[PDB]
């Protein structure tokens, strides 16, 4: 049925089942996660293997079974066959080192239990970006991306709690994706005039295919521009080169650090000599 309320009684059910004990469990899991982090690092040391690699082998073992397989640096490696090789390499490693495996396991599974508990927060966050130009579900999913992001960074040592730490990283994922994804272009099919049967593609003719003077012009343009750009002192050129043409619009803020007089001055004089060399 209608997925308005489905992923809500999805979320609020296991958050109903796990609304974290504000301190107790909350931190219980954070600690476990760091325990995993370091267990993993020392395991990298003992095995000569990659930290994120061990990380992912653990992850694969916990979730039961998965394709998974994406990592920084590389992108793959044989999954069902090989992962167990890594597990039995964990089985050789005596009590002393085995311990780190047991703990890392508990850690990563705690990490997931944590996110699962903290999702209703994402819900209530994304609730205040409703009519922004993204779907509520799109909003929330970006939020959850932000909360996972928060989990990977969080240092429980410094006493402040995850609720308000995560708040930020969620707001960041949301306002991040909002800029990209979200008077706009009007749809191609609308009743025009007498609202009978006309679609607004009906009414518009064709002009030109080649749309020329684009590639060739830019080709001459940027090159010559750059030629004279280079032929005068780079301070002056570059100033309103990038001030006017690599971010935004400012003369008040223009100077790195000289007089408004001097920017004004050398700007103008630079242009002058640039246009007509004597």
């Amino acid at each position: 049925k209608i997925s308005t309320s489905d992923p809500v009684r999805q979320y609020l059910h296991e958050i109903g089942q796990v609304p974290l004990l504000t301190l107790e469990e909350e931190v219980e899991l954070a600690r476990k996660v760091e325990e995993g982090m370091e267990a993993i690092k020392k395991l990298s040391e003992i095995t000569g293997l990659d930290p994120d690699l061990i990380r992912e082998v653990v992850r694969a073992k916990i979730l039961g079974s998965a394709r998974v397989r994406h990592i920084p640096g590389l992108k793959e490696t044989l999954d069902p066959k090989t992962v167990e090789e890594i597990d039995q390499k964990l089985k050789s490693l005596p009590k002393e080192h085995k311990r780190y495996l047991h703990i890392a396991r508990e850690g990563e599974a705690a990490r997931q239990h944590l996110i699962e508990a903290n999702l209703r927060l994402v819900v209530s966050i994304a609730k205040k970006y409703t009519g922004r130009g993204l779907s509520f579900l799109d909003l929330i999913q970006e939020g959850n991306q932000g909360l996972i992001r928060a989990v990977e960074k969080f240092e429980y040592k410094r006493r402040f709690k995850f609720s308000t730490y995560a708040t930020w990283w969620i707001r960041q994922a949301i306002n991040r994706a909002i800029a990209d994804q979200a008077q706009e272009p009007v749809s191609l099919e609308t009743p025009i005039g007498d609202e009978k049967d006309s679609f607004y593609g009906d009414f518009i003719p064709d002009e030109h295919l080649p749309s020329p003077v684009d590639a060739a012009t830019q080709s001459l343009l940027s090159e010559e521009l750059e030629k004279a750009l280079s032929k005068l002192s780079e301070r002056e050129a570059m100033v309103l080169k990038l001030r006017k043409g690599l971010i935004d619009g400012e003369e008040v803020g223009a100077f790195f650090g000289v007089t408004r007089e001097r920017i004004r001055q050398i700007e103008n004089k630079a242009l002058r000599k640039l246009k007509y060399h004597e």
Binding site: L21, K98, R105, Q112, L137, Q145, R149, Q183
Partner: protein, 211 residues
Amino acid sequence: AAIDPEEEVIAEAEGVVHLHEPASILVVKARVYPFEDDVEVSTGDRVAPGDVLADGGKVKSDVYGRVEVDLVRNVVRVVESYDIDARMGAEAIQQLLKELDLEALEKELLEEMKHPSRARRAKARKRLEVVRAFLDSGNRPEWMILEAVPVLPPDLRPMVQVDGGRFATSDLNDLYRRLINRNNRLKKLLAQGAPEIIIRNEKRMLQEAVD
């Protein structure tokens, strides 16, 4: 051990360690399998009775379940489950379709059709139609679900400049962006670690936007 090295509960002269007040109480259905000497096989795995449970031979657990590892009481609980191949959404059905013998289902339906008495075999007839359809000069039913989506060319769903700073868009492109969005966020949701209900929510979104 607590946060600050400042006053943590350091051990005094020998003391038997009892506990009074829990915050809550767990009632998991599980088997308690202590181990004393040597190590084991860590939290999470499947068992029934497996191979090498605890101490490296002595202990082996009978009942089917999921492994936990207790570092305090050096015990392992074994909760009720095993690799229970349970799937949700289209992936599951892709599988279902791939494992189907339409020849077999044909004969099965033949019998299902004629032999049961009337008021029933109507739907077996209608079902037979589609099976025959497939096994006729027809194709294999596993393509009935998608994992590759063709994109329509662009000029058939074009983009243009009307009256100045307005543009106009074939409605199909906003749906195609909807689906690029969802599918990509899915990929990076698998990359950036994978809590189930969230990935499902995304997968559901994905279905929704293909539809």
